[PDB]
Amino acid sequence: GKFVVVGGGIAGVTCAEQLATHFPSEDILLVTASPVIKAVTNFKQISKILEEFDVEEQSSTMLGKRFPNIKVIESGVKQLKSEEHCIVTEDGNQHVYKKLCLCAGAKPKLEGNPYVLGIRDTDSAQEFQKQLTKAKRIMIIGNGGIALELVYEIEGCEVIWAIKDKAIGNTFFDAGAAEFLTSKLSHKIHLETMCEVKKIYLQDEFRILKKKSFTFPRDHKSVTADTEMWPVYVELTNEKIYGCDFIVSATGVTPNVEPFLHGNSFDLGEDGGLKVDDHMHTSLPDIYAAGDICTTSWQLSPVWQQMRLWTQARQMGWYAAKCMAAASSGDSIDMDFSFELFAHVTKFFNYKVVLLGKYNAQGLGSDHELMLRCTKGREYIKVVMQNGRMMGAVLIGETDLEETFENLILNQMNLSSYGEDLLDP
Numbered sequence: 001g002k003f004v005v006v007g008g009g010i011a012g013v014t015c016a017e018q019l020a021t022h023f024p025s026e027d028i029l030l031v032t033a034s035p036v037i038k039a040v041t042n043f044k045q046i047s048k049i050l051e052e053f054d055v056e057e058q059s060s061t062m063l064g065k066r067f068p069n070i071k072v073i074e075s076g077v078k079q080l081k082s083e084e085h086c087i088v089t090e091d092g093n094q095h096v097y098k099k100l101c102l103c104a105g106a107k108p109k110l111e112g113n114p115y116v117l118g119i120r121d122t123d124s125a126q127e128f129q130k131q132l133t134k135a136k137r138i139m140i141i142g143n144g145g146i147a148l149e150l151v152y153e154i155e156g157c158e159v160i161w162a163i164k165d166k167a168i169g170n171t172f173f174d175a176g177a178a179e180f181l182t183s184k185l186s187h188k189i190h191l192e193t194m195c196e197v198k199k200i201y202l203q204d205e206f207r208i209l210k211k212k213s214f215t216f217p218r219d220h221k222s223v224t225a226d227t228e229m230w231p232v233y234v235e236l237t238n239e240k241i242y243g244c245d246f247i248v249s250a251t252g253v254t255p256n257v258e259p260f261l262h263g264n265s266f267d268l269g270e271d272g273g274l275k276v277d278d279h280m281h282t283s284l285p286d287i288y289a290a291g292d293i294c295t296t297s298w299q300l301s302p303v304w305q306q307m308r309l310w311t312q313a314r315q316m317g318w319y320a321a322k323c324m325a326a327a328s329s330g331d332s333i334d335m336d337f338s339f340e341l342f343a344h345v346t347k348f349f350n351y352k353v354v355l356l357g358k359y360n361a362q363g364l365g366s367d368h369e370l371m372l373r374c375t376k377g378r379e380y381i382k383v384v385m386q387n388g389r390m391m392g393a394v395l396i397g398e399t400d401l402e403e404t405f406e407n408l409i410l411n412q413m414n415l416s417s418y419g420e421d422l423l424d425p
């Protein structure tokens with residue numbers, strides 16, 4: 001059997017390229033479910049942990065031109081017979097493997113189909129907003145990715161933002177940092193909290209049903225009914241019903257583990273992903289996983305956590321490919337240092353954003369010290385500590401605590417002496 005890699009995603013492509021670079025004479029199969037292959041472009045090394053790049057899209061032949069021993073099968077996997085050491089794909093064909101790597105990623109949660117618009121990791125705020133110019137009122141559900149940036153961006157019309165959370169903020173920023181970012185930002189923006197889409201109607205069904213619809217809330221005096229018609233109507237969790245021109249969906253996402261589960265006995269993580277050890281090896285023999293589809297299930301570092309990220313996906317695919325290569329060669333790679341410190345770098349509202357470690361005190365509940373310095377429109381420096389040792393940080397705006405904070409979190413020394421010194425060079 002060949003080396004088989006499933007998923008034309010970041011982790012799958014990274015794994016396939018590394019496998020080709022490890023076994024040039026062998027053929028490495030890359031099973032994909034789309035004619036698009038996401039490639040990493042303009043890799044930037046910033047430190048031993050910090051890394052930045054962007055994501056372009058190639059065809060299959062573009063990859064084949066630089067990697068000839070990678071043969072791509074454009075037919076998504078529909079079944080995995082792990083006992084019989086093979087996979088069956090949509091065309092009806094079978095392919096045996098000596099070592100398999102699963103990188104199918106994670107699928108969304110999917111009812112007003114013409115007017116509900118999905119978002120993906122290739123969308124930008126301006127590019128997406130370009131189509132929403134001639135629209136009177138937009139409902140955005142969830143905080144996924146561009147959602148935050150989009151809510152406070154569109155100046156044209158009314159935004160209604162329905163979230164499961166209590167206050168504003170996506171997975172990156174708590175309510176404080178979200179408030180800091182949008183300080184410079186008229187926009188009719190109303191926030192519905194602790195709710196999700198209970199039901200959706202198109203006005204053809206709704207007018208037959210003949211139920212109410214509310215106005216955009218101005219004051220605390222009362223809630224009245226709408227007057228103008230709307231293409232779509234949303235009945236939210238808290239029985240509130242709103243008319244709407246277009247609906248942006250930024251809902252959650254679950255690992256795309258469905259095709260590979262029947263007939264097998266995978267050990268799943270709590271979130272539904274495939275559990276992987278420190279070698280990206282899953283519960284089943286000769287099967288590895290990386291990307292959004294897996295669950296890091298070793299004794300993880302206290303300043304690291306897994307997240308949906310291009311950076312983590314690339315790193316996981318790379319380590320998985322190297323582990324598969326070393327296992328086939330019997331080199332017995334014993335690297336236990338693999339993932340040391342969580343880090344992420346972005347620019348949201350023209351602000352340089354750097355997140356390190358337990359940047360929101362994830363997991364370390366109630367028994368954590370928090371320090372903060374701020375300058376409105378200029379700087380945000382949040383610091384999370386425990387037992388004198390630094391556990392995470394958020395640096396928004398052009399600070400220069402990035403390198404030093406990385407070093408401090410990695411060292412984890414009992415810095416019980418310094419007080420507010422840590423917030424200024």
Ligand SMILES: Cc1cc2nc3c(=O)[nH]c(=O)nc-3n(C[C@H](O)[C@H](O)[C@H](O)COP(=O)(O)OP(=O)(O)OC[C@H]3O[C@@H](n4cnc5c(N)ncnc54)[C@H](O)[C@@H]3O)c2cc1C
Binds near residue numbers: 011075078146290310
């Ligand atoms: C709206 C949104 C915005 C995001 N923004 C960012 C961002 O700004 N930065 C960031 O770092 N991360 C972002 N992410 C995270 C995103 O999920 C990353 O791309 C992810 O971390 C990388 O996933 P992956 O390596 O598992 O591969 P994926 O990108 O998930 O790709 C997996 C591949 O497998 C293929 N596949 C699926 N099923 C099968 C099958 N049965 N057989 C064969 N192939 C199959 C898919 O077609 C796909 O090509 C965002 C996610 C979402 C949803």
